[PDB]
Design brief:
By secondary structure, the protein is α+β, with helices and mostly antiparallel strands. The protein contains two helices and six strands. It has one domain: Roll (Pdz3 Domain), CATH 2.30.42. It is found in: Cytoplasm, Cytoskeleton; Nucleus; Cell projection, Lamellipodium.
């Protein structure tokens, strides 16, 4: 559903995740304005990964990484955790909105 939680198994082919995420670019919130934002996939850069698996698009909400809630994280901290994770990263997402 367009706000469902899916722990996506995002497998890195080589050059890290294909998702360029932001924490939240403050323009309110595409689902959570009164609530804190998590992390958002801003875009997909080739690689494979998100685009290849075909789950994540340029607007899905990232809640966490394998249950490690990204609440109050800046985009870098999210990605730092996404770099601490190995070849296949599990991310806890919610369906976002597309551009």
């Amino acid at each position: 559903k367009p706000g469902d939680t899916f722990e996506v198994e995002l497998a890195k082919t080589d050059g890290s995740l294909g998702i360029s995420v932001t924490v939240l670019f403050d323009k309110g919130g595409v689902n959570t304005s009164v609530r804190h934002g998590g992390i958002y996939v801003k875009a997909i850069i080739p690689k494979g990964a998100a685009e290849s698996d075909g789950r994540i698009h340029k607007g899905d909400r990232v809640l966490a990484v394998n249950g490690v809630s990204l609440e109050g994280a800046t985009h870098k901290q999210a990605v730092e955790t996404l770099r601490n994770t190995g070849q296949v990263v599990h991310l806890l997402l919610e369906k976002g909105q597309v551009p």
